[PDB]
Design a protein around this ligand. Structure first.
Ligand SMILES: CCNc1cc(F)cc2c1[nH]c1ncc(-c3cnc(OCC(C)(C)C(=O)O)nc3)c(-n3ccc(C(F)(F)F)n3)c12
Length: 187
């Protein structure tokens, strides 16, 4: 259960005061998009740093499957966001607010969590021509002490992701400063 994760966070995410754990949250999310790239269905990832020190990750993969998962009773998406046994549930648990948006089967689905707790089941909220998964999460002040993300640190590790996963283009955007960079390795 997520209760333990919130109770002793450094054990799961990394040090919660020096920025290590805080930045791991971003790459905990991003790695799922990378897995989808390794499978061959994701070519584009974008990471946005918001003025309120929240983070948005978005990929262009197949979208998380949304049909009802019967060992739980809830959408598989909700399962993946709320149960593990690091995963993306760790990020969810340690987030004040987190919005999940899935584009799949030409439909748009979303769900909102508060500290890893679903506010409504995955619901359909529109039509789309795109596909992929988007995640917007705000690190909990109850967990991390100095919430400020570093362009430099995110930039560095993204450059390496880009370098190691040829053919994936990764867009980094900081709305605090308006810096913007697309890392794609085609040299
Ligand atoms: C921006 C954050 N992105 C993101 C987070 C996350 F956290 C999971 C996913 C994600 N983007 C994804 N994009 C695709 C899948 C995905 C979709 N379908 C399958 O199907 C599996 C089969 C057998 C059909 C195949 O591989 O061909 N697998 C993964 C996915 N998901 C990652 C885990 C899942 C899960 F378990 F829910 F199925 N979806 C995620």
């Amino acid at each position: 259960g997520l209760d333990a994760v919130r109770k002793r966070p450094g054990m799961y995410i990394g040090d919660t005061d020096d920025g290590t754990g805080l930045h791991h949250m971003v790459f905990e999310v991003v790695d799922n998009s990378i897995d989808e790239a390794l499978a061959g269905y994701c070519s584009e990832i974008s990471i946005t740093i918001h003025t309120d020190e929240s983070i948005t990750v978005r990929d262009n993969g197949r979208g998380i499957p949304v049909d009802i998962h019967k060992e739980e009773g809830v959408s598989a998406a909700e399962v993946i966001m709320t149960v593990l046994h690091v995963g993306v549930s760790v990020v969810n648990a340690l987030s004040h607010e987190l919005r999940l948006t899935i584009r799949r089967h030409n439909k748009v689905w979303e769900q909102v969590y508060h500290h890893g707790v679903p506010q409504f089941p995955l619901r359909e909220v529109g039509e789309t021509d795109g596909s992929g998964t988007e995640v917007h999460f705000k690190p909990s002040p109850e967990t991390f002490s100095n919430i400020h993300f570093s362009w430099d640190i995110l930039a560095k590790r993204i450059r390496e992701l880009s370098f190691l996963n040829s053919g994936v283009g990764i867009l980094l955007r900081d709305e605090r400063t308006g810096k913007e960079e697309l890392f794609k390795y085609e040299g």
